[PDB]
């Protein structure tokens, strides 16, 4: 979603 936050490769929240 648009709320997504990608911390690093293969690791995204929301």
């Amino acid at each position, epitope marked *: 979603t*648009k*709320k*997504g*936050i*990608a*911390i*690093g*490769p293969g*690791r*995204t*929240l929301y």
Partner: antibody
Framework: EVQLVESGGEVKQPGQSLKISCKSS????????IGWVRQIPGKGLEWIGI????????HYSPSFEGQVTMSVDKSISTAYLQWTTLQASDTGKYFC?????????????????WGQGTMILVSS | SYDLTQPPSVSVSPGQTASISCSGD??????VSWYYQRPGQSPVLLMY???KRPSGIPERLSGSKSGKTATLTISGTQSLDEGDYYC???????????????????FGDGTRLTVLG
């Protein structure tokens, strides 16, 4: 234009309450996280927290948690930072910023938009 | 959570390349972003996802990462390049008693670039 405009600088006494604002324009306010960062004159950037305007979901820095509160008023595209009781250690330039979600080959985020800052001086 | 370490200062001669490091325990698997800040002004995004430049940022500026160290490289340095540079990354973890993932924005202490003009 796409920007964040913050409220004016203020001199406050310790013990006083305070609420500063950040008005967003130029993009869909509800869909991008808003971050807050403090910078003591001559020092580095200190993260305060982030809040998602659409639902007010929030993440705070342990250093600022319970000391300040983040909120938003969706109707006027404004984000706020508020204190119940100020301390001299709250002195500093406060910036609000927008976390942009780059929808490229791989997704990633970065604070691409920054307000002009609000200087808060807490002194007796 | 992990600390991000940056050299407090970097000096370079005009036209030469300057490199600014940023080290952190989880950086090897965390995207790094870089910001520029001129005295009295607001920060400006220079790089994200380790090596990506947002629109308008010149090609002479590049970002990379090796192991737990991210590096911002400025080639063809000029006097106007002076100022502070900050690296930034994230940390994510779930509390032992639940409550969903907790996010943390991490900033390096900053590096002041000096261009010997």
């Amino acid at each position: 234009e796409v920007q964040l405009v913050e409220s004016g600088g203020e001199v406050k006494q310790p013990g006083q309450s305070l609420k500063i604002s950040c008005k967003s324009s130029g993009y869909n306010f509800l869909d991008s996280w808003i971050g807050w960062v403090r910078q003591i004159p001559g020092k580095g950037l200190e993260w305060i927290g982030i809040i998602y305007p659409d639902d007010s979901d929030a993440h705070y820095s342990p250093s600022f948690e319970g000391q300040v509160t983040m909120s938003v008023d969706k109707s006027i595209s404004t984000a706020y930072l508020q204190w119940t009781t100020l301390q001299a250690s709250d002195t500093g330039k406060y910036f609000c910023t927008r976390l942009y979600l780059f929808e490229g080959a791989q997704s990633s985020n970065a604070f691409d938009l920054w307000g002009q800052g609000t200087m808060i001086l807490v002194s007796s | 959570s992990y600390d991000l370490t940056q050299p407090p200062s970097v000096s370079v001669s005009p036209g030469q390349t300057a490199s600014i490091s940023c080290s952190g325990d989880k950086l090897d698997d965390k995207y790094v972003s870089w910001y520029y800040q001129r005295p009295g002004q607001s920060p400006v995004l220079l790089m994200y996802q380790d090596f990506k430049r947002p629109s308008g940022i010149p090609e002479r500026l590049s970002g990379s990462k090796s192991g737990k160290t991210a590096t911002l490289t400025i080639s063809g340095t000029q006097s106007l390049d002076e100022g502070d540079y900050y690296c930034q990354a994230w940390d994510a973890s779930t509390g032992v008693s639940g409550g969903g993932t907790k996010l943390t924005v991490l900033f390096g202490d900053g590096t002041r670039l000096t261009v010997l003009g």
